Design a protein around this ligand. Structure first.
Ligand code: XG4
Ligand code: MG
Ligand code: MG
Length: 430
DNA sequence: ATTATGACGCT
DNA sequence: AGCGTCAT
């Protein structure tokens, strides 16, 4: 009743750049704009692997993870841009720099948490209180929400999508009590106004379009963001959760798309998020552990407490390359050469990070994969990172991994290596 | 032969 | 510390 917390204390948004790497390449090359196009890394093997797809190309069935040659079968006029190659490997610097452009604009409006190269959570609670004081009980005009969808509306008592959007928004605004400065629905609405402004600023100052979700926590904001892509934003209210979750496959919720979600489905014999409400918190904890069980009990009611961490910069800076099938490294000279290439890229990125961000990494993590292992990492070993020197870093990585070489011979490497990975971690202010 | 990252939980 | 899971 009156003591049952409803998880409506915060306003949280999730901003995700639409087909990011594609947009970066389309800004640079106008010939790619408003076309089916995709971004690929490498080229020789099956045309390269697609990692980003414009919405025009998605209409033909092109997806991430698809080989470019296969995508061309679905979409013969697909345009391709290739990721830059440096020191023998894909180099993603152009997209990281574009990411920084966007994140610095977002940070003008509120403290953000960088969740990926192209997505950030925003805690808008305080900004919303400020705007509410400025409004002075003035209603919110639909004109201030020109790209906003209200999930679940319209309902009750009509052909085109923009008309649908406007009907739902009008129903939402008509039911708003702008008198009450602590109304959660009002707070979400003002949050949506602020996100319209943030998205307008991003597009004006970078050329990039994005989608966004506005709700009371990170998981609902993330789910909301996906409901109306591209170039739109969606408000998911607390009240919309029962209907939304009643047909929502468990795997759609961030963190339940893998083994844990499969176990929820299999153990409980359910399919949809909403079905979780019928279990007690102790029941869920008994199946899935204390932490997961409490999290699921709250999440299926729309409640989640994970804070938006004030963290605009990545916590690690890493370099990795796969050596699949027959390209695997089977000589010591090979392993040393590729460790050096990875370490030279890492040195370049670390030196730029130190100059930009007043910090220094102190730990080097070396990960390898050996032929035959189905795991991402076969071995992970750390050593000290005391100088930004590529030859030192590559020598240190070789020292920590050299005992994996089964070959009695000194020149050969067996079993051959199918992945190398260097990661700088444990930053300190400098 | 998807690949290149990056975050975080467990023990 | 090293490994696994979840992303994508
Ligand atoms: N190197 C690499 N980059 C990747 C990979 N997957 C994605 N990227 C890169 C390329 C992506 O552009 C970027 C952002 O990832 P998303 O937000 O998941 N996809 P997007 O923004 O394209 O589409 P949407 O409109 O649905 O949000 O990360 C990968 O496996 N490897
Ligand atoms: Mg995106
Ligand atoms: Mg993203």
């Amino acid at each position: 009743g009156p003591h049952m917390a409803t998880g409506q204390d915060r306003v949280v948004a999730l901003v995700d750049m639409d087909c990011f790497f594609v947009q970066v390449e389309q800004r640079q090359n106008p010939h790619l704009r408003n076309k089916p196009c995709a971004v690929v890394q490498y080229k020789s093997w099956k045309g390269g692997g697609i990692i980003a797809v414009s919405y025009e190309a998605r209409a033909f069935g092109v997806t991430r993870s698809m080989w470019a040659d296969d995508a061309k079968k679905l979409c013969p006029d697909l345009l391709l841009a290739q990721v830059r190659e440096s020191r023998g490997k894909a180099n993603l610097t152009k997209y990281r720099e574009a990411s920084v452009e966007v994140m610095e604009i977002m940070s003008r409006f509120a403290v953000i948490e960088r969740a990926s190269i192209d997505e950030a959570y925003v805690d808008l609670t305080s900004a919303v209180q400020e705007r509410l004081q400025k409004l002075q009980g003035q209603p919110i005009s639909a004109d201030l929400l020109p790209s906003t969808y209200i999930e679940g509306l319209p309902q009750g008592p009509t052909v085109q999508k923009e008309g649908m959007r406007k009907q739902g928004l009008f129903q939402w605004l008509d039911s708003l009590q702008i008198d009450n400065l602590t109304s959660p629905d009002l707070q979400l609405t003002v949050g949506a106004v602020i996100v319209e402004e943030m998205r307008a600023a991003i597009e004006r100052e970078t050329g990039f379009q994005c989608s966004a979700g506005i709700s009371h926590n990170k998981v609902l904001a993330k789910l909301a963001c996906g409901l109306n892509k591209p170039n739109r934003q969606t408000l998911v209210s607390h009240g919309s959760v029962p209907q939304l979750f009643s047909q929502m496959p468990i795997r759609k919720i961030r963190s339940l798309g893998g083994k844990l979600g499969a176990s929820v489905i299999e153990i409980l014999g359910i399919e949809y998020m909403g079905e979780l409400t019928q279990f007690t918190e102790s029941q869920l904890q008994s199946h899935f552990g204390e932490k997961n069980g409490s999290w699921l009990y709250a999440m299926c009611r729309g409640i989640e407490h994970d804070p938006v961490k004030p963290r605009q910069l990545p916590k690690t800076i890493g370099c990795s390359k796969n050596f699949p099938g027959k390209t695997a490294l089977a000589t010591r000279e090979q392993v040393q050469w590729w460790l050096l290439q990875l370490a030279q890229e890492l040195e370049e990125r670390l030196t730029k990070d130190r100059n930009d961000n007043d910090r220094v990494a102190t730990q080097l993590v070396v990960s390898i994969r050996v032929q035959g292992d189905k795991r991402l990492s076969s071995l992970r070993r750390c050593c000290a990172l005391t100088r930004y020197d590529a030859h030192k870093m590559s020598h240190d990585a070789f020292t920590v991994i050299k005992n994996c070489n089964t070959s009695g011979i000194q020149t050969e490497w067996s079993p051959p290596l199918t992945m190398l990975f260097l990661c700088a971690t444990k930053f300190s202010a400098s």
